[PDB]
Amino acid sequence: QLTPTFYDNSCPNVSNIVRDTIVNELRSDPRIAASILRLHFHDCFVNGCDASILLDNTTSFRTEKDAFGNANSARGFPVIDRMKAAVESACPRTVSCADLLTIAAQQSVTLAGGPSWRVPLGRRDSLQAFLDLANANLPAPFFTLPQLKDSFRNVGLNRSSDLVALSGGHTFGKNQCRFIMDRLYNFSNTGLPDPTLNTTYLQTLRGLCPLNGNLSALVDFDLRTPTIFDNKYYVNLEEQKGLIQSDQELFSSPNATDTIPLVRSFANSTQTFFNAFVEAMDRMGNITPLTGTQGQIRLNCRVVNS
């Protein structure tokens, strides 16, 4: 079983070293907290939180960094290297990259103003990466609600609360114009915008993402508080101001009978949202972990120990 006190004897200062690394990076890159949380999410949705996403290419297996959900999107890898090196210096061969990334995600959420809690620990590192699995398992912004639900259930998260609370990760961070172009100009081959997108916000987004414009341009997931981890994401949904299709569907999909009440509850109470987010985060962090003597304690998160 994973436990929050796993390193209290072997590396009591791990969380503090992780936090310091993020605080320092945030001064030059205010987006890093969001980026780190997403790295953890994409690690857990592919063979569990086993740091498989951190592995680079080898002649025997491809890196997950080239998956459709990671390529030209996932970022922050050098920062993870930096904190890993610091932790290795403080406590040699003790903290796994899988655990390191989990702590980094929690600390990132807290530093951004979110809830503070001690994540379960004891995960170990994978001996390979899974590109095909990443392409199959990572959800896409154009998924319908049934597909989003299918994606979460596929990795072990059956609850609507898991999906609604974790989607709250979009209370901060950036998104490329590429992923919303259809909603703005030609949704589902209608030549018209997505009707569930607020028309006033539609104009704002069209201004940021013009037709035939820079598809790589970045837009904030949360128009209310772009870099603060709070429940504003849900208030946006209630006003049809979710940025991507997968966001708005939680509130507007014909299949949202079970998700709508959750969206409202999280929009109405920060405490309700924060509690649900921590619960969902720990559940996601509990997806098929390698424990005990399974896997290893990777020294360089980019390569398997030899």
What φ, ψ does residue 63 adopt, rounded to 5°?
Answer: -80, 150
- Residue in 52, 137, 246, 252 binding ligand HEM, rule: CB under 6 A: 246
50 makes contact with Ca ion (CB under 5 A): yes
243 makes contact with ligand HEM (CB under 6 A): no
Which residue, 203, 206, 157, is CA-closest to 41? Answer: 157
Per-residue x/- track, 40-59, ligand HEM (CB under 6 A): -x------------------
- How is 124-175 classified by DSSP, letter by letter? BB-SS--HHHHHHHS--TT--HHHHHHHHHHHT---HHHHHHHGGGGGS-EE
Cβ atoms of residues 268 and 169 within 8 Å: no
Catalytic member of 19, 42, 124, 183: 42
Cβ atoms of residues 10 and 89 within 8 Å: no
Q: Which is nearer to ligand HEM, 171 or 295 (CB)?
A: 171
43 makes contact with Ca ion (CB under 5 A): yes
**End-to-end Cα distance, the chain:** 27
Q: For the CB of residue 230, give the shortest distance to Ca ion in the complex, in Å.
A: 5
Distance CA 224, CA 186 (A): 26
Distance CA 302, CA 106 (A): 21
Token match 């809690």: residue? Answer: 117
CA dihedral 197, 201, 207, 213 (to 10 degrees): -30
Cβ atoms of residues 144 and 256 within 8 Å: no
265 makes contact with ligand HEM (CB under 6 A): no
- State yes or no: is 40 an active-site residue: no
Q: For the CB of residue 140, give the shortest distance to ligand HEM in the complex, in Å.
A: 5
- Residue in 35, 52, 70, 151 binding Ca ion, rule: CB under 5 A: 52
Distance CA 286, CA 157 (A): 10
70 makes contact with ligand HEM (CB under 6 A): no
Per-residue x/- track, 149-178, Ca ion (CB under 5 A): ----------------------x-------
- Residue in 23, 192, 228, 303 binding Ca ion, rule: CB under 5 A: 228
Task: Tell me the binding residues.
Answer: 43, 46, 48, 50, 52, 64, 139, 170-171, 222, 225, 230
Binding site for Ca ion (CB under 5 A): 43, 46-47, 50, 52, 171, 222, 225, 228, 230, 232
Q: Give catalytic residues, as residue numbers.
A: 42
Binding site for ligand HEM (CB under 6 A): 31, 34-35, 37-38, 41, 73, 75, 139-141, 143, 148, 166-167, 169-170, 173-176, 179, 244, 246
